Amino acid sequence: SLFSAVHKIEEGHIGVYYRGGALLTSTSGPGFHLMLPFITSYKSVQTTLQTDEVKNVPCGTSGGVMIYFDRIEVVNFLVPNAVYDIVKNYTADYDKALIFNKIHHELNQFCSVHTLQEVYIELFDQIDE
Amino acid sequence: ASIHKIEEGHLAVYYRGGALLTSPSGPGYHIMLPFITTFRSVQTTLQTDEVKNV
Amino acid sequence: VLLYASIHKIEEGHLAVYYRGGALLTSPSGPGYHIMLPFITTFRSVQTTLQTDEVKNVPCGTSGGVMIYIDRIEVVNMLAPYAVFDIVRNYTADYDKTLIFNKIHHELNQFCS
Amino acid sequence: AHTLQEVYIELFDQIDENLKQALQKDLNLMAPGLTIQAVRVTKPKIPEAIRRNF
Numbered sequence: 001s002l003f004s005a006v007h008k009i010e011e012g013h014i015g016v017y018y019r020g021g022a023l024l025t026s027t028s029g030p031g032f033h034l035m036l037p038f039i040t041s042y043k044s045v046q047t048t049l050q051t052d053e054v055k056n057v058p059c060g061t062s063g064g065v066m067i068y069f070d071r072i073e074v075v076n077f078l079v080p081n082a083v084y085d086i087v088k089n090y091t092a093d094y095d096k097a098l099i100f101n102k103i104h105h106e107l108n109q110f111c112s113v114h115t116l117q118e119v120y121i122e123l124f125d126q127i128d129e
Numbered sequence: 130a131s132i133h134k135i136e137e138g139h140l141a142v143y144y145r146g147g148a149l150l151t152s153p154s155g156p157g158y159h160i161m162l163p164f165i166t167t168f169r170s171v172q173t174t175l176q177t178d179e180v181k182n183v
Numbered sequence: 184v185l186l187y188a189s190i191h192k193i194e195e196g197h198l199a200v201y202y203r204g205g206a207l208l209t210s211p212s213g214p215g216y217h218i219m220l221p222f223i224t225t226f227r228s229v230q231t232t233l234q235t236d237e238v239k240n241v242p243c244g245t246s247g248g249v250m251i252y253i254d255r256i257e258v259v260n261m262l263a264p265y266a267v268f269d270i271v272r273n274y275t276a277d278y279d280k281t282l283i284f285n286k287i288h289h290e291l292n293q294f295c296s
Numbered sequence: 297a298h299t300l301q302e303v304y305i306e307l308f309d310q311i312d313e314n315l316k317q318a319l320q321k322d323l324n325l326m327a328p329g330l331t332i333q334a335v336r337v338t339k340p341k342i343p344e345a346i347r348r349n350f
């Protein structure tokens with residue numbers, strides 16, 4: 001009954017509501033909030049700085065040798081006003097389809113132009129940028 | 130039970146006896162004919178998929 | 184009991200930040216006894232005095248291509264009391280993991296490459 | 297049209313672009329409306345004998 005209506009949003013998140021699969025154009029900030037009892041589903045998307053990583057990323061150097069980055073972490077944040085558009089276009093898991101599904105391709109494209117030494121030592125500080 | 134609650138980011142196309150009705154339907158709750166009509170939703174947003182060992 | 188549920192103590196050098204339904208109430212409390220609504224509101228005390236923490240076995244790839252592992256890197260820090268509200272509003276309470284000790288390894292690696 | 301070196305190293309950054317260009321060129325006239333936002337490819341697996349030499 002009213003148990004489902006209430007829901008905590010947590011600080012630093014924004015809640016997006018689905019009306020049986022359709023995204024309402026109303027978003028709720030942190031704090032106590034109330035929605036419809038059973039025909040609306042809320043999910044909170046983080047709008048503060050957050051981090052996530054991908055492990056064992058291959059990288060083929062210009063010399064034909066393959067080197068595997070153990071871990072590549074990306075720290076990102078989403079402005080609160082664009083949350084509605086972001087979730088509408090790419091759902092609540094936008095990060096996987098926007099960043100971490102192409103990290104490996106970007107790394108391989110960068111590596112293909114640089115040699116093993118060039119990536120391992122010389123321009124290591126430039127890989128991040 | 131006929132209600133189908135089309136998803137967000139998809140668009141639904143119906144089939145009345147294996148025929149494409151000219152009327153689509155956007156996200157949200159919708160009502161179709163009880164049994165003669167069957168719906169299916171195709172994703173109109175960004176969609177990823179791959180082929181392996183090419 | 185209401186008293187047992189609500190009464191809480193804030194240690195010296197710590198600033199308390201409360202949460203009602205996930206929101207951040209704009210009213211931090213200093214050390215000493217304090218009253219908060221028993222059930223809905225929950226407190227967490229962030230240390231503002233000098234604090235220490237450490238990271239282990241940080242790798243380092245020297246310019247010669249050889250790997251050297253630094254066993255222990257300790258950082259001691261502190262934040263002014265007035266900044267507790269903002270530093271908790273962003274980065275949550277556990278600001279250290281995402282502000283210092285996640286970047287330690289990468290900064291050291293960049294320096295020592 | 298390309299050799300092992302060109303595909304494996306030199307033109308890797310162009311494999312995906314060429315694939316996307318070809319597919320979109322076909323679809324433009326076959327099935328208007330569909331668009332290929334992006335394409336990705338992993339590095340090819342070259343033979344073991346050629347791998348040792350590298």
Ligand SMILES: *[C@@H]1O[C@H](CO)[C@@H](O)[C@H](O)[C@H]1NC(C)=O
Binds near residue numbers: 328329
């Ligand atoms: C479907 O085929 C017709 C007939 O060739 C063509 O005019 C039309 O553009 C095509 N549309 C799509 C979406 O494939």
